[PDB]
Amino acid sequence: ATKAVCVLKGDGPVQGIINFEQKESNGPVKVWGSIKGLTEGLHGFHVHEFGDNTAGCTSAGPHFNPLSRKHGGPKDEERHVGDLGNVTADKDGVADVSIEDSVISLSGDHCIIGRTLVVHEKADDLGKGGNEESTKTGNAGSRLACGVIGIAQ
Amino acid sequence: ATKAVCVLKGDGPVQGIINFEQKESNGPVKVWGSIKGLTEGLHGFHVHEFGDNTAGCTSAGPHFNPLSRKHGGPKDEERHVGDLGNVTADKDGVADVSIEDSVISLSGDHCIIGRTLVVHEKADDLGKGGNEESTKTGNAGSRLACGVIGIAQ
Questions:
Q1: How many distinct structural domains can be found in chain A?
Q2: Which residues of B are known to be catalytic?
Q3: Domain interval for residue A147
Q4: Parallel, antiparallel, or unpaired for β B83-89 and A29-36?
């Protein structure tokens, strides 16, 4: 079983620890953990292409999209590999993450190790926001916190 | 040419940017960049097994040594995959890095993507320190700064 971890850090109070586990190479990836310092509501939760944090979360580049598809929700057929949808934060700003995804992987072509996980300012509209930006980034806004996905024990 | 990058950060003033470039899968990895906030002299420069920063640089675990060899200098036959020797800091605390290594890789069994690059407190004795610890870590001491090795543009 291959395991990975991501420590989310940003310029504000947004911080968190996200774990990934894939017991079979052709099976789903379990993604769990907790993020604090968020505003109440939904926040875009995406895997971005580069594990580059030289100039903050912006250097992570665009969404991880090796198949060059339109942006969508995680349950959609038309989605980027990095399209993990939204995380929901409670009144105290704590988002309890528990996601199972079959598009992302911890090995091969759709491998997310060495890439950046980003928690966004606003909700990801899941490609149904009614504008050009919605079909690319889902109008999720600024990058609150990010971290490079690394190999875990 | 596959590219990787690492942003070094710690609890102290040590901060740096390190680049990795491997033009051919079997070819050598060109590692270059700069590290500041360092005491003048030599500092251990090692790739550690885990890309885990949950408890700072300690969670990165031991040296990346998949072939279970003794610690040595980068020019030695007997060395860990992660044994990148020493970086040299000037009187102003700046360490200019320009290393070429044929043991580390950005693919295959020796892939360092998603692992942690660490700059240490003291000089790496390169296994020639004369004690049991020398053949394990090179007596490089504390972990000043670390970062997960991520995929770059």
A1: 1
A2: 46, 48, 63, 71, 80, 83, 120, 143
A3: 1-153
A4: unpaired
